[PDB]
Every structure is written in C-alpha cells, then in structure tokens.
Amino acid sequence: GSSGSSGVVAPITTGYTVKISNYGWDQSDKFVKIYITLTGVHQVPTENVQVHFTERSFDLLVKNLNGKSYSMIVNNLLKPISVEGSSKKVKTDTVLILCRKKVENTRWDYLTQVEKECKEKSGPSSG
Numbered sequence: 001g002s003s004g005s006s007g008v009v010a011p012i013t014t015g016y017t018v019k020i021s022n023y024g025w026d027q028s029d030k031f032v033k034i035y036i037t038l039t040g041v042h043q044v045p046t047e048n049v050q051v052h053f054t055e056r057s058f059d060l061l062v063k064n065l066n067g068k069s070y071s072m073i074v075n076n077l078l079k080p081i082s083v084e085g086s087s088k089k090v091k092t093d094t095v096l097i098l099c100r101k102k103v104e105n106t107r108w109d110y111l112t113q114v115e116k117e118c119k120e121k122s123g124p125s126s127g
Contacts, residue, residue: 014063020072027108032081032099034111039093040066051097053086058099060088076113079106 025034041049044064051060058081059073077099085100110116 014069017061017063017069017071018065020060020070023072025111027111029105029107031101031104032079032108034097034099035091036060036072036095036097037093038062038065038070038095041070041095042090042092049088049090049095051088053081053083053088053099055083055102056080058086058097060095060097062095074112078108078110078113078116079103 020036020038023034023036025032027033041062044062048063048065048069049061050063051058056077056079057073057075058077060071062070062072072095080102082100082102087098087100089096089098110119
C-alpha cells in the first residue's frame with residue numbers, strides 16, 4: 001500500500017466555539033440529567049455533537065449550530081457517574097445530557113464541587 005498526495009487551500013472555516021455559561025441541570029434519586037437551551041442542536045447531526053462522559057465529569061461539544069458553535073464541559077462532579085451507562089440526548093432547541101448515578105438515593109447540592117466549595121467557604125471544612 002502506501003499511496004496518496006494532495007494539497008488545497010482552506011479559508012476561514014468555523015473553529016471557535018461558544019461557551020455555554022447558563023445551562024439548566026437537574027438531579028433525581030436515580031440519575032442525573034442536564035438541559036441546555038440550544039436552538040438548532042436538534043437540527044445538527046450527531047457528528048457536530050461530541051460529548052464524553054467520565055467518572056466525575058462530562059464534556060459536551062457542539063459545532064455548526066445557529067450560525068455558530070457551542071461548547072459545554074463540566075469538570076468535577078459532586079458525585080460520580082457511570083460512563084458506559086451515561087448517555088446523551090437532544091431535545092427541541094435543547095440538548096440533554098443523561099449522566100448515570102454511580103450511587104442512587106443521593107442529592108446534588110451543586111452540579112459540580114467547585115460551586116459547592118466556593119458556595120460553602122466558611123463552614124465545617126476540617127473534620
């Protein structure tokens with residue numbers, strides 16, 4: 001084998017992505033799911049939507065959207081989640097992010113720990 005050759009110029013095509021600051025999320029004694037408002041995400045292919053689930057985090061990318069691209073990643077989750085079990089969904093002008101609950105019957109005071117920590121600055125940290 002081993003055979004190929006080509007070279008063409010490529011103009012300014014996409015690249016940058018929007019940062020999803022405001023995003024709705026909810027948790028229930030069973031599983032975790034997030035709901036973001038993205039008009040067009042229900043029109044874009046699953047190829048433009050790249051999301052990866054982890055043990056305590058989850059990344060979600062969104063390219064080619066409403067005349068732009070959006071990105072959403074969460075690092076440090078109050079509680080762990082099941083990747084294999086974790087799944088992603090897309091609703092009308094909305095993106096769903098099903099995150100399996102590593103342990104059911106649990107409450108999430110905050111999507112992530114960061115918020116918590118910050119939120120709870122002067123508290124019973126030690127002990």
